[PDB]
Amino acid sequence: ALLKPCKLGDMQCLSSATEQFLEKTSKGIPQYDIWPIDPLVVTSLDVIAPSDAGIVIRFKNLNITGLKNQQISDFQMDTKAKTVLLKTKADLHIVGDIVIELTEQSKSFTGLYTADTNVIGAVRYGYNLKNDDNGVQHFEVQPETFTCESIGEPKITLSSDLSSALEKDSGNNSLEPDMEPLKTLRQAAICKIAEACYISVVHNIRASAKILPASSFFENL
Numbered sequence: 001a002l003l004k005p006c007k008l009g010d011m012q013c014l015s016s017a018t019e020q021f022l023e024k025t026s027k028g029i030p031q032y033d034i035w036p037i038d039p040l041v042v043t044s045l046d047v048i049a050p051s052d053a054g055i056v057i058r059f060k061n062l063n064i065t066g067l068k069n070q071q072i073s074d075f076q077m078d079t080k081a082k083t084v085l086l087k088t089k090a091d092l093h094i095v096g097d098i099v100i101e102l103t104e105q106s107k108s109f110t111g112l113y114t115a116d117t118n119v120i121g122a123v124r125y126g127y128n129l130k131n132d133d134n135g136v137q138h139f140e141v142q143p144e145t146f147t148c149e150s151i152g153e154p155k156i157t158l159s160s161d162l163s164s165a166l167e168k169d170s171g172n173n174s175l176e177p178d179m180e181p182l183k184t185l186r187q188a189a190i191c192k193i194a195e196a197c198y199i200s201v202v203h204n205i206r207a208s209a210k211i212l213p214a215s216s217f218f219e220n221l
């Protein structure tokens, strides 16, 4: 029992089912293919700066805490058109290796990246209801669409040496938020990190719905 079954529409039951689920799955369940979500590690993620093609940010081994305590802020399940809209509020703390490539100059900056913010992640997915060969009914959750509805106000830190290197390159005594690469680090990088998190989040729902009878998610249908 990793699932508490809920009546359709009871946000109270859903909220404590969500709490249960994230705790039970926080450090992963490899026999069910459930990825660890808190702490969630992201091997590798690149982001280009939307407003500068010559800045490549490469993240390695990001350590992300705070997903096991996400709160449902919107749930819209249409049992006719067979769709789900889920939105959650998460308090994220993110730490990891960062590589900043200024390709146009053939320069590079290695270091440690830190981010704290609250995000709101929005996922939309279709599903079907379908039986096993053993004759047990399962949800099949189709590939989801993700929106980074809110990135909050991120608090970004870089390593002390990484900072001094950029201060020496740019020519300013401080790191500059109205400029590159902090602008990308505050925004798009956050939007992308949040997407990686909700990919794992939605995969775990998918993965668990392969194993568990659909009646373990909702009682009537």
Ligand SMILES: CC[C@]1(C)O[C@@H]1CC/C(C)=C/CC/C(C)=C/C(=O)OC
Pocket: 014, 017, 018, 021, 022, 084, 086, 127, 139, 141, 201, 205, 209, 217
């Ligand atoms: C396959 C099930 C279904 C149709 O997609 C609907 C279930 C969505 C939710 C919130 C169920 C409550 C328990 C879970 C797993 C919460 C969760 O993982 O939050 C991130």
